[PDB]
């Protein structure tokens, strides 16, 4: 478990995982793997106060798409808004597993989150979910009044493959010429369908997210090699010209995460393309510390969450 330099509570978490192992996640059926995350997130008392949650089903992408709209409690008027794309490696995850993370971003930013219930993998494959994600984002931009938001002040946010999804939705919005986006919040994003970065090599196991999981996640998403080479799957492969004009980004990475290097590399490519980027590595931390309910009271995690909420707020102001 862990490494020299892992933050103390995080290291204890890793050791607890190592104890009483269980089968590797990637050896489970999608149903059983989904239940592992559900059970783990439900195992910890967490503050979910300060929010008003309501479901809305929309017609877009030529289908019905379910949204969970999460609004700061006791606030009147149209509020700015961020789309929220959940992580879980495409196979896992949903709204309640991610509700604490979403709640923290909403309460900290004062903005409304719109969770999009994209179709999981392998039930669907690329590009089904990203097309749903984009469709919902366009819908919010043009129909925001219906759910109490100002669709002209619109960001995208997500963790892990949700960070992939947020980045790709920003690219799709550029491709489509609409909608205008204020900001992209990328928390430990997946950015490349390749597994040879220094961080992938160093943290292959023992640090929660493993290389084995990442390959399984990608395989469930799509085994089409040409699909994986597209910028809408692996945005790290985009040229400077393709990245030009994307909205300002905050990218948080974790020191002990296989995805650390590709996230920081994507931030560099955005910067080289003239996009405004803040790229921050949280040392001592593991992958997706912001999702994990058992880590939500770690002081560094709280600091990272204060930052994520504040930066959403900064970019969602009037004028």
Ligand X SMILES: CC(=O)O[C@H](C(=O)O)c1ccccc1Cl
Site residues for its own copies per CB under 8 A: 4-5, 7-8, 248, 250, 264, 267-268, 271, 274, 276-284, 299-300, 303-304, 306-307, 310-311, 314
Q: Does 60 bind ligand X (CB under 6 A)?
A: no
Whether residue 164 contacts residue 190, with contact meaning beta carbons closer than 8 Å, is answered with yes
State the nearest-atom distance from the C-beta of 75 to its own copies, in Å. 21
Pick between residue 147 and residue 305 the one whose CB is nearest to its own copies: 305
- Please report whether residue 80 would count as binding ligand X according to CB under 6 A: no
Task: Round to whole Å and give the CA distance between 82 and 159.
Answer: 13
Q: By three-state DSSP, how is residue 140 classified?
A: helix
Q: How far apart are CA 41 and CA 45, in angstroms?
A: 9
Q: Which does 209 bind (CB under 5 to 8 A by kind): ligand X, its own copies, none?
A: ligand X
User: Contact 84/102 with Cβ under 8 angstroms?
Assistant: yes
Q: Which of 307, 274, 273 lies closest to 289, judged by CA?
A: 307
Q: Draw the binding track, 145-164, toward ligand X (x: CB under 6 A; -: no contact).
A: --------------xxx---
Q: How many residues bind ligand X (CB under 6 A)?
A: 32
213 binds, among ligand X, its own copies, none (CB under 5 to 8 A by kind): ligand X
291 interface partner picked from ligand X, its own copies, none, CB below 5 to 8 A per type: ligand X
61: CB partners within 8 A, 6+ apart? 131, 132, 134, 135, 136
- Residue closer to its own copies by CB (options 139, 183) is 183
Nearer to ligand X, 139 or 217 (CB): 217
DSSP 8-state class, residue 151: E
Q: How many other CB atoms are there within 10 angstroms of residue 21's CB atom?
A: 7
Q: Residue 40 Cβ, how far from its own copies at the closest point, in Å?
A: 24
Task: Write the DSSP assignment of 162-193 as a string of letters.
Answer: HHHHHHHHHHHHHHHT----SEEEEES----S
If binding is defined by CB under 6 A, does position 40 make contact with ligand X?
yes
Kindly state whether residue 291 participates in binding ligand X, applying the rule CB under 6 A.
yes
Assess contact for 259 and 253: CB atoms under 8 A. yes
Question: Per the structure block, which two tokens stand in for 262?
Answer: 């590709």
The interface partner of residue 4, options being ligand X, its own copies, none and the CB cut-off 5 to 8 Å by kind, is: its own copies
Give the pair of three-digit tokens for residue 255.
């020191």
Q: List residues binding ligand X (CB under 6 A).
A: 17, 22, 25, 36-37, 40, 87-89, 92-93, 159-161, 190, 208-209, 213, 217, 248, 276, 287-288, 291-292, 294, 297, 299, 302-303, 314-315
């Amino acid at each position: 478990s862990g490494s020299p330099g892992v933050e103390q509570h995080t290291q204890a978490f890793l050791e607890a995982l190592e104890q009483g192992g269980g089968k590797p996640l990637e050896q489970l059926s999608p149903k059983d793997a989904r239940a592992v995350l559900t059970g783990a997130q439900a195992s910890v008392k967490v503050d979910l106060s300060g929010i008003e949650v309501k479901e809305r089903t929309i017609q877009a992408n030529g289908q019905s798409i379910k949204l969970q709209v999460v609004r700061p409690a006791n606030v009147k008027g149209e509020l700015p808004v961020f789309m929220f794309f959940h992580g879980g490696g495409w196979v896992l995850g949903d709204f309640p597993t991610h509700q604490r993370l979403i709640r923290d971003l909403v309460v900290g930013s004062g903005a409304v989150a719109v969770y999009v219930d994209y179709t999981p993998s392998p039930e669907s494959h690329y590009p089904t979910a990203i097309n749903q994600a984009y469709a919902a984002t366009q819908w919010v931009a043009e129909h925001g009044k219906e759910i109490g938001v100002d669709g002209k002040r619109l960001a995208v946010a997500g963790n892990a493959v949700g960070g992939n999804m947020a980045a790709v939705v920003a690219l799709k919005a550029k491709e489509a010429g609409t909608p205008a986006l204020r900001f992209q919040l990328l928390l430990h994003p997946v950015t490349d369908a390749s597994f040879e970065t220094a961080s992938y090599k160093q943290f292959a196991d023992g640090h929660f997210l493993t290389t084995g999981m990442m390959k399984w996640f990608w395989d469930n998403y799509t085994t089409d090699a040409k699909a994986r080479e597209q910028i809408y799957a692996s945005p790290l492969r985009a040229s400077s010209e393709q990245l030009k004009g994307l909205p300002p980004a905050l990218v948080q990475t974790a020191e002990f995460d296989v995805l650390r290097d590709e996230g920081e590399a994507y931030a560099r490519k955005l910067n080289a393309a003239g996009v405004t980027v803040t790229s921050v590595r949280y040392n001592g931390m593991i992958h997706d510390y912001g999702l994990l309910n058992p880590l939500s009271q770690v002081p560094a995690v709280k600091a990272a969450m204060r930052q994520a909420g504040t930066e959403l707020k900064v970019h969602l102001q009037l004028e």
